C-alpha cells in the first residue's frame, strides 16, 4: 500500500505543497482520506509503471489496471467480511471481466499484454 | 423569405419553476427549530410532502435530519417541542 503520508492524487501536483504546514500535509495525505483515494493512488502508480501513455484511460490496459485495483479492494473487503455475498459476486464477475479483457489484449497486442501480466502479477490461464 | 412567419425559440413567457421553501438552504439535524416546523404538534409525526410542500430531495433531507435529531438527543419523538409551537406555520394542515 502507498505510505499514509502520500498526498492525494489531486493535491500532489499543486505548486508549493512541500512548503505547507505538516498539519496541512496530514489533511491532504491518504491517512486523512477514505480507502478509495488510496485505490486511485495505486491506479496512478500502476499506470505510470506499466502503460506507455499514463494519461490514456480508455485503453484496454487502463481498464485492466483499474479492474485489477478494484479486484484487490474487493479481496481486501472480503477478507474481513467473509459473508458478503454481494461483494463475492462482484469479485468473481470482475475476475471474469479481467480474464475477458486479458484475452482481448493478448489477441490484439501481445507485448503490451506481457507487460500487463508482469506488472500486475496476473498469471493468464487458458480456460479448460 | 417571408418575415412574418413564426420563429423557433424557447418559451419566453415560461414562468420560473416553483421552488420549495427550503430550496438552496442547508438542512441540519441540529436545526431543531426548523425540523419542528415539519412535525405534528400533538403526535410528533413527520408530515408528508403533500402537507409540507417540499420537493422530494428536501423532504428526504428533512426526514433524515429529524430521525437523526430524535435518535441523537436533539429532538423529541412523541411530540413537537413546545418552545417551537409559535414558529411560522409552513405546513398546509389545519386541525380545528
Amino acid at each position: 500500500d502507498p505510505p499514509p503520508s502520500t498526498l492525494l492524487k489531486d493535491y500532489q501536483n499543486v505548486p508549493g505543497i512541500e512548503k505547507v504546514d505538516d498539519v496541512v500535509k496530514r489533511l491532504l495525505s491518504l491517512e486523512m482520506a477514505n480507502k478509495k483515494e488510496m485505490l486511485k493512488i495505486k491506479q496512478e502508480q500502476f499506470m505510470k509503471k506499466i502503460v506507455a501513455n499514463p494519461e490514456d484511460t480508455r485503453s484496454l490496459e487502463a481498464r485492466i489496471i483499474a479492474l485489477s485495483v478494484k479486484i484487490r479492494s474487493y479481496e481486501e473487503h472480503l477478507e474481513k467480511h467473509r459473508k458478503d455475498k454481494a461483494h463475492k459476486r462482484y469479485l468473481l464477475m470482475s475476475i471474469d471481466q479481467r480474464k475477458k479483457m486479458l484475452k482481448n489484449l493478448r489477441n490484439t497486442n501481445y507485448d503490451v499484454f506481457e507487460k500487463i501480466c508482469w506488472g500486475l502479477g496476473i498469471e493468464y490461464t487458458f480456460p479448460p | 423569405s417571408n418575415e412574418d412567419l413564426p420563429i423557433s425559440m424557447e418559451n419566453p413567457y415560461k414562468e420560473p419553476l416553483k421552488k420549495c421553501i427550503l430550496c438552496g438552504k442547508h438542512v441540519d439535524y441540529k436545526n431543531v427549530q426548523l425540523l419542528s416546523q415539519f412535525v405534528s404538534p400533538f403526535t410528533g409525526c413527520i408530515y408528508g410532502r403533500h402537507i409540507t410542500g417540499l420537493c422530494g430531495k428536501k423532504q428526504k433531507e428533512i426526514t433524515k435530519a429529524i430521525k437523526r435529531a430524535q435518535i441523537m438527543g436533539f429532538m423529541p419523538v412523541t411530540y413537537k417541542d413546545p418552545a417551537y409551537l409559535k414558529d411560522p406555520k409552513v405546513c398546509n394542515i389545519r386541525y380545528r
Binding site: 496541512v24 491532504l28 | 438552504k25 441540529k30 436545526n31 406555520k89
Partner: protein, 48 residues
C-alpha cells in the same frame, strides 16, 4: 486556492497548546444552529 484556504484555517485549529484556552472560550461562548423558515422562504433567526 483550496490549499491556501486550508493553510489559513489550520492556524485556528485546536492543538495541545491552546487546548485549555479554547475549552474555556467555548464554555464562555454559545453557538446556535436554530432558525425557522417562512412560507415565503425567509429565514427567521432567534431573538438572541
Amino acid at each position: 486556492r483550496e490549499v491556501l484556504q486550508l493553510q489559513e484555517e489550520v492556524k485556528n485549529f485546536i492543538t495541545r497548546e491552546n487546548l485549555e484556552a479554547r475549552v474555556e472560550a467555548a464554555l464562555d461562548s454559545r453557538k446556535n444552529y436554530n432558525w425557522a423558515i417562512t412560507r415565503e422562504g425567509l429565514v427567521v433567526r432567534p431573538q438572541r
